[PDB]
Design a protein around this ligand. Structure first.
Ligand code: HEM
Ligand code: NIO
Length: 143
């Protein structure tokens, strides 16, 4: 896979934007997932009763999902490939994890980065994350 230095530089800087206010931006992330995938609270316990900003898991889970996706960009840049941990592959083997759902999560994350970067947003930025995620998602899908 073709992932450039500049693409990584973008992924990194937008991620730091995220990390500036994870509390704020994680709300966006889950609000989005539930609007598009309402079954998603049967799966995610901490979302059982809607988006609970008091639940500490909400920001833990989000920081960890965003970071992994960054890691990927970093990997594509380093190795031209992405590798997924065994455990991450094992939990996503459940039937709730469908192609249609990969989209939802994806659109939710780009939606969250946007709000995080503001006017610094562009197709270019959207594309590097896009790659980062899609390359990881496949790395999960069978690994
Ligand atoms: C590239 C896309 C994805 C990434 C990076 C990702 C990342 C993660 C991470 C980091 C965890 C573990 C969190 C923890 O407990 O600390 C996890 C678990 C999980 N993921 Fe994702 N995931 C992705 C796609 C999906 C999709 C499309 C679905 C379908 C709804 C999904 C459903 C789940 C479920 C049900 C769990 C287990 C819940 C639990 O923690 O008990 N994931 N995933
Ligand atoms: O909260 C999580 O752990 C989560 C949310 C979406 C996709 N994968 C994992």
């Amino acid at each position: 896979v073709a992932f450039t230095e500049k693409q990584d530089a973008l992924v990194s800087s937008s991620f730091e934007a995220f990390k500036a206010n994870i509390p704020q931006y994680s709300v966006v992330f889950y609000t989005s997932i539930l609007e598009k995938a309402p079954a998603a609270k049967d799966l995610f316990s901490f979302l059982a009763n809607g988006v609970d900003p008091t639940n500490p898991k909400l920001t833990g889970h989000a920081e960890k999902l965003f970071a992994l996706v960054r890691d990927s960009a970093g990997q594509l840049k380093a190795s031209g490939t992405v590798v997924a941990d065994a455990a991450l592959g094992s939990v996503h083997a459940q039937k709730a994890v469908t192609d249609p759902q990969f989209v939802v999560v994806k659109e939710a994350l780009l939606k969250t980065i946007k709000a995080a970067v503001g006017d610094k947003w562009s197709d270019e930025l959207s594309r590097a994350w896009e790659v980062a995620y899609d390359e990881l998602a496949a790395a999960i899908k069978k690994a």
